[PDB]
């Protein structure tokens, strides 16, 4: 089997991407944030505290003939941005892009934090990291990918995120029309439950490439590129008037600037992030200070190749017995 679904930016900045997902029978279509940095499939639901729902589409298990309470199971998750959610669990049929899993754990939110409530465009998350991170207790549950894997033509999924445009998530096949040149594969460590890999270095603009190992995660659920402070300082030093602002919470730059590109290494290959991808616009409406898309990881504990980086590539998440990542230009 295979599946193929279009993923769409939620706003003009590409702050996140949503992908329609069919849950239940008859289908209830929710728009979920596919997150390769977490491992829970959770939804706004008929159980979510009413004051915490503001425009999201909800899953109502009582209207699904295939929903079953997963008795005794609960979940609770906290993300890197300080957001959180928790609730109980159903199993139900879940389809993405024509690929169906029966008996998928669908984590129904009873509580969500304010950042979720305030984002009317995101109806929940679909985690695509390793199932070792799934938060369901007392019986940990599998991700949609892990449940689909054995049925897929190839045990892979791919992320092809657009810059200010829709893109695609494919399951079970690699669309050889979707990228240019060849795919470079690199090793993955699953020790922390992430798609964790080591970049071979970076360049700023037309500058020389610096060979240096940067361990980090491929995380579709993170907007920005978070790298070591040395790397980030070297990038922003090439932008007149850029500075780190403790009041704003990262590097800002004059909206009048033209940003340089940023290159990262994948083995001997190179992915170039155009400068425009690094512009996240005014810090507040009408400001002439703009927020940067490359930020320091120093206060996180891990480097994160988020959407800024991943949208410059065609990315293969190879879930074979020994997982690997692949990157191609496009």
Swiss-Prot record:
Membrane-spanning residues where? none
**Cysteine-cysteine disulfides:** 255-290
For this UniProt entry, the molecular function terms from Gene Ontology, in alphabetical order, are: aspartic-type endopeptidase activity
All copies of domain Peptidase A1, residue ranges:
17-328
GO BP: proteolysis
Q: Indicate the residues that form the catalytic site.
A: 35, 199
Which EC number(s) are documented for this chain?
3.4.23.22
EC supergroup of this enzyme: hydrolase
Q: What is this protein called?
A: Endothiapepsin
Sequence similarity: Belongs to the peptidase A1 family.
What's in the keyword line of the UniProt record? Aspartyl protease, Disulfide bond, Hydrolase, Protease, Signal, Zymogen
According to UniProt, the reaction catalysed is: Hydrolysis of proteins with specificity similar to that of pepsin A, prefers hydrophobic residues at P1 and P1', but does not cleave 14-Ala-|-Leu-15 in the B chain of insulin or Z-Glu-Tyr. Clots milk
């Amino acid at each position: 089997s295979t599946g193929s679904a279009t993923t769409t930016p939620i706003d003009s900045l590409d702050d996140a991407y949503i992908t329609p997902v069919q849950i239940g029978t008859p289908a209830q279509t929710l728009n979920l944030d596919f997150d390769t940095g977490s491992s829970d499939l959770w939804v706004f639901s008929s159980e979510t505290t009413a004051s915490e729902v503001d425009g999201q589409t909800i899953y109502t298990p009582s209207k699904s003939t295939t929903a079953k309470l997963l008795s005794g199971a609960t979940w609770s998750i906290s993300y890197g941005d300080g957001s959180s959610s928790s609730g109980d669990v159903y199993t139900d049929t879940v389809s993405v892009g024509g690929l169906t899993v029966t008996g998928q754990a669908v984590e129904s939110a009873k509580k969500v934090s304010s950042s979720f409530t305030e984002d009317s465009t995101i109806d929940g998350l679909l985690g695509l990291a390793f199932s070792t991170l799934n938060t369901v207790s007392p019986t940990q549950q599998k991700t949609f990918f892990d449940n689909a894997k054995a049925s897929l033509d190839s045990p892979v999924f791919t992320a092809d995120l657009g810059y200010h445009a829709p893109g695609t998530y494919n399951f079970g096949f690699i669309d050889t029309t979707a990228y240019t040149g060849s795919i470079t594969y690199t090793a993955v460590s699953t020790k922390q439950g992430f798609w964790e890999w080591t970049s071979t270095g970076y360049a700023v603009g037309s500058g020389t490439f610096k060979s240096t190992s940067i361990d980090g995660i491929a995380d579709t659920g993170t907007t920005l590129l978070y790298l070591p402070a040395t790397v980030v300082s070297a990038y922003w030093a090439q932008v007149s008037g850029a500075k780190s602002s403790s009041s704003v919470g990262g590097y800002v730059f004059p909206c009048s600037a033209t940003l340089p590109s940023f290159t990262f290494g994948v083995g001997s290959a190179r992915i170039v992030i155009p400068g425009d991808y690094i512009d996240f616009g005014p810090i507040s409406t009408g400001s002439s200070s703009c927020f940067g898309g490359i930020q320091s990881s120093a206060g996180i504990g891990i480097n994160i190749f988020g959407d800024v980086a991943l949208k410059a590539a065609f990315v293969v998440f190879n879930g074979a017995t020994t997982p690997t990542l692949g990157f191609a230009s496009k």
